[PDB]
């Protein structure tokens with residue numbers, strides 16, 4: 176992995192500058208005892224560019240952690256735009272709130288604390304959709320079901336992005352016993368059979384373990 | 395590279411289906427002595443998806459080869475959409491025209507034969523722009539100047555994509571002797587310095603050699 180990390184540092188040195196709010200969001204993970212699993216700086220910038228191509232005014236994120244990915248995307252929003260992010264762990268949600276406040280995004284970002292599978296039908300009842308872009312990055316086994324709820328909260332042209340769908344190439348092992356690999360494989364099979372979207376999977380290398388993100392556009 | 399190749403085939407079995415027109419465009423290369431350097435199927439679907447996000451009506455492509463990338467992007471267009479593709483080699487242009495005709499894309503694709511640096515100022519003079527998406531994929535040394543012309547043919551929100559800007563990590567080598575590597579390094583420096591766009595570089599692995607594509611959006 177060394178060449179991929181060195182090339183990622185080359186790219187972030189040109190195009191992946193992180194202000195105090197993004198660095199503080201990263202620094203908050205270890206002091207809070209949270210896992211070091213945010214998107215990378217360059218992945219962050221890529222999510223921001225996708226939100227700009229979507230001309231996104233309304234973004235939904237499942238899985239906030241410390242709000243690193245949230246800050247990157249919310250920075251693409253217009254003044255009147257909104258990002259709703261779902262986080263199960265009340266400690267993660269409190270840390271993310273501090274980090275979003277430090278980024279001056281309190282007004283545009285709403286953190287909802289609970290399981291995505293409980294909150295997604297709430298968003299349906301509220302008529303919270305449709306969203307211009309949806310980022311699925313929570314627990315891995317129910318990605319397939321999160322995608323079905325995302326469709327209910329989409330319009331034609333909505334972008335749905337799902338992170339961690341390759342898992343170091345372990346998705347090739349049909350006999351994998353790892354929950355996160357089985358979750359990825361089931362989601363990828365659903366995505367291959369889904370006639371409601373146009374989709375691809377991007378292999379991703381860099382500072383993080385070899386992985387990939389799925390991208391889908393609602394027909 | 396074996397794991398990346400195996401994962402790419404896994405991905406294209408799910409989401410990278412190629413019809414006769416794309417398979418025929420690939421098959422056309424060997425009989426014409428052309429390099430097997432088109433975008434991969436999965437890269438082709440990615441460019442198609444970027445064109446759909448752009449809601450592209452007008453696309454510009456530098457470097458046609460056999461029209462493989464051209465067919466993937468043109469298929470995102472509405473019928474009244476147009477794609478202009480530039481190609482220096484008349485042998486390549488004639489193969490690409492056959493492949494575009496086979497794909498049913500004759501109305502939507504205009505292949506222009508000559509040096510990109512000669513045609514781009516003609517496009518500005520004709521008012522051919524602005525393009526919703528621009529794909530820079532010709533010879534590598536003038537990438538920096540192709541990008542300057544692309545900005546003259548853009549509007550706010552235009553997506554510019556440049557292929558082959560990592561070259562197996564050789565862009566880390568400040569003493570590279572390879573003009574294509576030197577061209578990518580100069581392009582990536584320019585892109586780092588450019589205040590007219592928001593940009594990133596995506597590292598790309600799969601069936602082809604380790605490389606990367608630059609994505610830039612012209613600021614609003």
Ligand SMILES: Nc1ncnc2c1ncn2[C@@H]1O[C@H](CSCC[C@H](N)C(=O)O)[C@@H](O)[C@H]1O
Nearest residue numbers: 213214238240243244262263290291313314
């Ligand atoms: N059922 C569930 N609903 C919502 N969030 C969940 C969940 N199960 C786990 N999570 C949360 O999903 C997150 C995954 S990590 C998210 C990383 C973040 N998007 C970033 O890149 O910065 C964790 O914070 C975890 O607590």
Ligand SMILES: Nc1ncnc2c1ncn2[C@@H]1O[C@H](CSCC[C@H](N)C(=O)O)[C@@H](O)[C@H]1O
Nearest residue numbers: 432433457459462463482509510531532533
């Ligand atoms: N100065 C120049 N102007 C225009 N095209 C050029 C050029 N120098 C090289 N080319 C052409 O650029 C092409 C690069 S390969 C293009 C591959 C194609 N985009 C695909 O993915 O399917 C070759 O066809 C080459 O002949």
Ligand SMILES: [Mg+2]
Nearest residue numbers: 214312338339
């Ligand atoms: Mg993730």
Ligand SMILES: [Mg+2]
Nearest residue numbers: 431531557558
């Ligand atoms: Mg190329």
